[PDB]
Design a protein around this ligand. Structure first.
Ligand code: NAD
Ligand code: NAD
Lengths: 331, 331
């Protein structure tokens, strides 16, 4: 039974908190953000995309109570000042978006936490990076910092895994059409990415995706074969990946779809219905394969394979991260 | 001077009407739709995406008056009942979306107009289909029915033309992330396309694109080389195309961008700024090339070229269609 602190009680941190309430072997004993406890308790209870948390939620001083559970609430901008040794923290979930480097995440280790899971790709290629049910068994008990990759990586990685194991990828491209996130702007405002600066709910916004630099770390044999980008669009949550690849073998559409069905798990859903993004909101699958969209572009004997998967960039990622935390409990 | 009628006074029909007010060799003398003239006058005056038309607009009986100009208004669901012979119509702009077949559009010929331009791909592959400043000089006097293709085709066609003439296309794929249109549903409602049935302003919606069948007709050497689809997303108007292709020659990114810039015209904008979809609302360019996004996926000597162009699926297409109309006025 491991003790967890959540650094950054935001969209990802709060949903991870919600999900950990039902995991028996994991207790969140502390959270940290930049505001009063009452604000966090209110944002924990009411969630624009994922509905109300139907538990009695109280605040007394810096103590968040959820029915009978007591959670210490801190407001410390410098994680090295967090009292992780005093609270015997086993794992910090680092979900501020502000400590994704090895040095940044290790400030929690200096504070006394035994292990850090970054809710994003790490800055360095040397950090252990996992997608649950693709390569999480590569985690070592010696890994002090672990990256759970990005939302798009968790969507993309099962597809790449299946194509690589079954057919062999030569090269390809990916594109995610992706819900806007808190890194964008409600009204046109300063941002170093001059397109993420732009009013997010009325704009198609081209930008980077973390899946580009993380996919080769999760499926090593696909390293260097894919690139792509993100078009952020005005939906609150919910996203889709289009992957177009040249394969070594030449399967039929039916064989590609069957290869995906066989990899179905708690992390990978085989969908057969003509759905749209809102149908995956709050999903617990890290990836939802859209088998009706699979098609081949065939020109003079050349074949370009196109496959699609959905993901709730919040919930899908959150339950993957939660699966990683539970696995670390057994370590 | 040619006399024009507009059949279908919708998003496209009204913006075409607006633009034709500034073209002196083209007089719109009649319009047709399914409502009272007062309704049409108001929708012509006030436009949610493109702002107010600042003229005096009056209705007296079935006559729409704009300053000094008088326009007859009709409400005939069956185009063969329209009085095109009496009003000496040279060109009908068929923009209802309900007469895109050769037999459907030809009802305007039976009614007495000399020539019909469909504001969409035609049902038949044999109909003359044009993108202005790509292949509009292929129009002949035998072409009584002409298709101005689709909005995505008008954006994509100059890129396919430039790549094909300079470098040769082997095969590739296109994806358009596309504003919602009147063919989608505001609330989940019946539609033969079960994804276009879904609430359009809260969903990413995978669907067909008319550019998949129209591109081979406009750039003949590229026929059969491309396929792709559309993701409708919640923006009122404004769209982008990503084109990923294998090329015979191996140009640099700079040489690809330079080839695009050489082909610039009133139909094709060379853009160097980091824009988003709202910056192309009301554009008169058929296609807006995003030079900053051009990149190459290079894997052990294999190259995948990726290029991007924006378009206001309304105004960009509208101004392309008006250029076809002006050209038809000369021949
Ligand atoms: N939103 C998604 O779809 C998504 C998906 C996967 C991964 N992620 C990643 O998860 C991380 C968080 O994303 P998010 O959407 O939750 O963002 P967010 O803005 O909702 O959450 C970040 C939270 O951290 C707090 N914070 C900021 N600086 C802090 C500091 N110095 N100390 C303590 N708290 C601090 C903020 O107040 C905020 O509540 C990012 O790395 C992001 O890339 C996000
Ligand atoms: N909206 C775009 O982005 C876009 C872009 C390029 C081409 N187009 C094409 O242009 C056409 C029109 O599209 P739109 O967006 O203007 O749609 P719309 O719904 O705004 O316009 C269609 C109009 O035709 C009228 N109408 C319907 N049936 C009629 C009939 N039998 N007789 C007379 N009037 C009738 C409707 O009342 C409406 O005003 C379609 O073929 C569409 O594919 C649309």
């Amino acid at each position: 039974t491991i003790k967890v602190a959540i650094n950054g009680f935001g969209r990802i941190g709060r949903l991870v908190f919600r999900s950990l309430l039902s995991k028996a072997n994991v207790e969140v004993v502390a959270i940290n953000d930049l505001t009063q406890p009452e604000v966090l308790a209110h944002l924990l209870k009411y969630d624009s995309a994922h509905g109300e948390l139907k538990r009695k939620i109280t605040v007394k001083q810096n103590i968040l109570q959820i029915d009978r559970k007591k959670v210490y609430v801190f407001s410390e901008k410098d994680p090295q000042n967090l009292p992780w040794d005093e609270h015997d923290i086993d794992v910090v979930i680092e979900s501020t978006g502000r400590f994704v480097s090895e040095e940044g995440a290790s400030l929690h280790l200096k504070a006394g936490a035994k292990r850090v899971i970054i809710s994003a790709p790490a800055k360095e290629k040397t950090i252990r990076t996992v997608v649950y049910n693709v390569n999480h068994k590569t985690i070592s008990s010696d890994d002090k910092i672990i990256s759970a990759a990005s939302c798009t990586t968790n969507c993309l990685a099962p597809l790449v895994h299946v194509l690589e194991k079954n057919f062999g990828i030569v090269y390809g491209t990916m594109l995610t059409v992706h819900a806007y996130t808190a890194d964008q702007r409600l009204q046109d405002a300063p941002h170093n990415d001059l397109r993420r600066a732009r009013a997010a709910a009325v704009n198609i916004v081209p930008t980077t995706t973390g899946a580009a630099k993380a996919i080769g770390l999760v499926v090593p044999e696909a390293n260097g074969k894919l690139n792509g980008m993100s078009l952020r669009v005005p939906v609150l949550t919910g996203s889709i990946v289009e992957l177009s690849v040249v394969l070594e073998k030449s399967p039929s559409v039916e064989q590609v779809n069957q290869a995906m069905k066989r990899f179905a798990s708690a992390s990978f859903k085989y969908c057969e219905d003509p759905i749209v993004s809102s149908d995956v909101v709050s999903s617990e699958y890290g990836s939802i394969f859209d088998s009706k969209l699979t098609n081949i572009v065939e020109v003079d004997g050349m074949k370009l394979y196109k496959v699609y998967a959905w993901y709730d960039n919040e919930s899908s990622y959150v339950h993957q991260l939660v699966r990683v935390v539970s696995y670390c409990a057994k370590l």
